[PDB]
């Protein structure tokens, strides 16, 4: 209910085009309390499924041969970061085994483990496949701000989709 929230608010944003592609979700354990309410709030463009991404049987029913990309999410609040992102590599292996040509977008908790994606013979970043390394960007934005303050909040505003808003007041936030 938190991990999808920051994603869905920006993916289904009103200020992009009628790019109505969001129609699926897939993980073993059943949804809980207001996650089902958040799915019902977007009843037309969610279509969740129970099923495990390690079975080529489950991938076949999700029609992943037809899909444009496969977005993989990982919990930055893990008890052992070097176990999760290693586990997450074989999620990429399972997908690339079932179908080699699909785009993978993924997130990595540590930096060193990012090298492993190049070993998978059908990973080619020149076709779009990429790994968002959380420690690399997190410490990168902070490092950049030691040269000029506010550059972290500058860049973090360029990627989230955001409407223009009018404020009548002369408070600082009118210009912001």
């Amino acid at each position: 209910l938190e991990s999808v929230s920051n994603f869905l608010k920006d993916f289904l944003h009103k200020d992009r085009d009628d790019v109505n592609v969001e129609i699926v979700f897939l993980h073993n354990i059943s949804p809980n309390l207001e996650l089902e309410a958040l799915f019902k709030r977007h009843f037309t463009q969610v279509e969740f499924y129970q099923g495990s991404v390690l079975n080529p049987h489950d991938l076949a029913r999700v029609k992943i041969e037809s899909a444009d990309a496969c977005l993989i999410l990982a919990n930055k609040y893990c008890a052992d970061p070097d176990a999760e992102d290693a586990s997450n590599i074989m999620r990429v292996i399972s997908i690339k085994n079932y179908h080699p040509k699909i785009r993978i977008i993924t997130q990595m908790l540590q930096y060193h483990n990012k090298a492993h994606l190049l070993n998978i013979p059908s990973w080619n970043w020149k076709e779009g496949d990429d790994a968002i390394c959380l420690a690399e960007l997190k410490l990168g934005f902070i490092a950049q701000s030691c040269l000029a303050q506010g550059l972290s909040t500058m860049l973090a505003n360029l990627f989230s989709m955001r409407s223009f808003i009018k404020i009548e007041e002369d408070t600082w936030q009118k210009y912001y």
């Binding site: 009103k14 009628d18 037309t44 409407s163 808003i165 404020i167």
Partner: protein
């Protein structure tokens, strides 16, 4: 305090038919069965 709150923006069409397709098929089956039973 609570800013402008949010914005009133929504653009949906139930795709074309989903709940109406399910209900109209179900109703047709109910009328078929209750015809035979009657």
């Amino acid at each position: 305090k609570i800013r402008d709150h949010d914005l009133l923006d929504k653009r949906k069409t139930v795709t074309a038919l989903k709940a109406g397709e399910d209900k109209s098929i179900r109703l047709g089956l109910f009328l078929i069965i209750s015809g035979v039973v009657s």
